[PDB]
Design a protein around this ligand. Sequence first.
Ligand SMILES: *[C@](O)(C(=O)NC)[C@H](C[C@@H]1CCNC1=O)NC(=O)[C@@H]1[C@@H]2[C@H](CN1C(=O)[C@@H](NC(=O)NC(C)(C)C)C(C)(C)C)C2(C)C
Ligand SMILES: *[C@](O)(C(=O)NC)[C@H](C[C@@H]1CCNC1=O)NC(=O)[C@@H]1[C@@H]2[C@H](CN1C(=O)[C@@H](NC(=O)NC(C)(C)C)C(C)(C)C)C2(C)C
Ligand code: NA
Ligand code: NA
Lengths: 304, 304
Amino acid sequence: SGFRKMAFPSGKVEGCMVQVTCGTTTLNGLWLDDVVYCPRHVICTSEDMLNPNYEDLLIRKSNHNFLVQAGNVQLRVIGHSMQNCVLKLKVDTANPKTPKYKFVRIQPGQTFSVLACYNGSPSGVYQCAMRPNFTIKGSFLNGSCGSVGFNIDYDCVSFCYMHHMELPTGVHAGTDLEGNFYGPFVDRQTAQAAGTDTTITVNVLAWLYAAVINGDRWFLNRFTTTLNDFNLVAMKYNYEPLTQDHVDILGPLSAQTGIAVLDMCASLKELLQNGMNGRTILGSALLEDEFTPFDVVRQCSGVT
Amino acid sequence: SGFRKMAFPSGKVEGCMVQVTCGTTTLNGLWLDDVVYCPRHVICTSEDMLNPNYEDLLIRKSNHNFLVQAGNVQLRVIGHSMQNCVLKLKVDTANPKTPKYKFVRIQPGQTFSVLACYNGSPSGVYQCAMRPNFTIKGSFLNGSCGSVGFNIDYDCVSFCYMHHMELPTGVHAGTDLEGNFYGPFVDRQTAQAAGTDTTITVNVLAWLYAAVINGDRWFLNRFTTTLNDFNLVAMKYNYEPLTQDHVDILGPLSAQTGIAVLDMCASLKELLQNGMNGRTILGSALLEDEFTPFDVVRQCSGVT
Ligand SMILES: *[C@](O)(C(=O)NC)[C@H](C[C@@H]1CCNC1=O)NC(=O)[C@@H]1[C@@H]2[C@H](CN1C(=O)[C@@H](NC(=O)NC(C)(C)C)C(C)(C)C)C2(C)C
Ligand SMILES: *[C@](O)(C(=O)NC)[C@H](C[C@@H]1CCNC1=O)NC(=O)[C@@H]1[C@@H]2[C@H](CN1C(=O)[C@@H](NC(=O)NC(C)(C)C)C(C)(C)C)C2(C)C
Ligand code: NA
Ligand code: NA
């Protein structure tokens, strides 16, 4: 028993992290096969950042402008390309440590693990979720750009995030590895705001299943509810709506604990209106919405 | 900006994790050089656990009783030894992936990263601290035994914890890699209780420095305090006492933010007496004591 914010092992992704320098601007790229993926604003200067025309900045750039450093080796760049907001530096040499990998664009609510890098070197690993506003609450300093979010399906590293931007609040924005931004954000240093940040209800419900399973049970209560009437209440507290899919998803946990989702909804409903009255659940004083139904199943069945 | 519970990269330690089976009982061992370290209760059956005489259980055991499995290889065991509560299986082959390593016994308050394993396979990584009662609040299921806690000093993996036991509460106990238990715990399934779990004050003070640095500043206040008078108050809320060493330790953060420790103590003092009044600090509704002064410096300077 016990329940933690737990990242996948970083080891397989560690092998893929390289430094990418362009003039002054230096940051992290991801090396899979004979291609290094990095944010395209590696090309920009501090001033260029204010309003870049990348197309235009790319004209005065050749393969040899791009310093791909793998720890203390230099990969030869034999091609560069722009795919939405990432550069794809074709290098002579395939990453020998390339894992089985996919690029997936996550939906909001899905969680993934961040391997935070500086100078193309892992500093730390942590979990987080794609909020519904399409930000994440990372920890990221200058030089973190091109650090990646991943999940692992046993053998296979699924890459979902490349880190580009911080927004006032210390929330973060970035791209899939196809370089399409999550949410309405652009790689410019112009005004642009996150929308309302909603709570991921299905994730909060899974957390409570995770709570129950560990023997924190007190929030449980006599009442049941309907999807519709729980939403009437949720909406107000800025919770993502719940759906039959969310319910089907939670089934495993429902089956594990013998507590129908709709019962757990009633339990969660009261906590929304009455708060936690000083108590914790799994040593959290607030309702934790950064666990997928899978995160709990993973951690409470203990899959590897 | 942004601040997370962030584990070191697991990759270097991943290489060291092997399955160890003895009859029925199967769990994780750590493979460095020609030695595999595991909990000694690999030898016990379910019944033996109730009150084992290891010395005595070790008599009816030979090298060949111990199945050291490295993914899908079998390491030959050419020697076994008992060091307090760990076995040391001498094998023919040195782990080629052995990192630069040390074994350190941490003091309580120090944090380290857990790489949670089943069948000698990394399932997940998370940070935690050695509470002052000498428990940790892991997440650990049956098969997790012999999973290790580590820190990294740039090149060098420092191993501080091997996981043995869960206690009612879902708190956990275990050993240094010399197999001496942290705290008064024994590898028997007998009654034995954790002491009072105290809050790690120096760690809470660092968290607030971490808060300040990210622009959560509101808890800051007009008052200063003395070490003595803050303790008079702390004691009551079950906070670890503060010392001149704790103050010298926090200096870097004090210097970073221009806020004397004793000021931060006054700020923390009021929050102890008045609570947080619904507000969060770094999106935590309670005072987080699972960050070393180094954890913040690491994450907020961004060392690798
Ligand atoms: C990134 O380039 C890097 O790590 N290498 C230098 C960097 C990461 C960033 C630094 C602080 N925290 C982080 O996550 N990202 C940037 O420098 C991006 C680049 C240039 C500015 N910028 C920002 O993130 C800026 N944010 C905003 O401009 N904010 C709004 C869009 C809401 C205004 C700063 C102010 C520097 C954080 C672009 C976005 C291409
Ligand atoms: C470990 O052996 C393993 O993972 N491989 C089988 C296992 C880890 C444990 C299972 C549930 N959560 C965990 O962290 N540890 C044990 O089985 C240890 C072994 C045998 C019993 N035991 C316990 O942890 C038991 N706890 C207690 O006995 N509790 C007190 C000492 C306070 C009574 C259980 C009840 C099984 C959790 C010894 C301690 C050698
Ligand atoms: Na970009
Ligand atoms: Na033991």
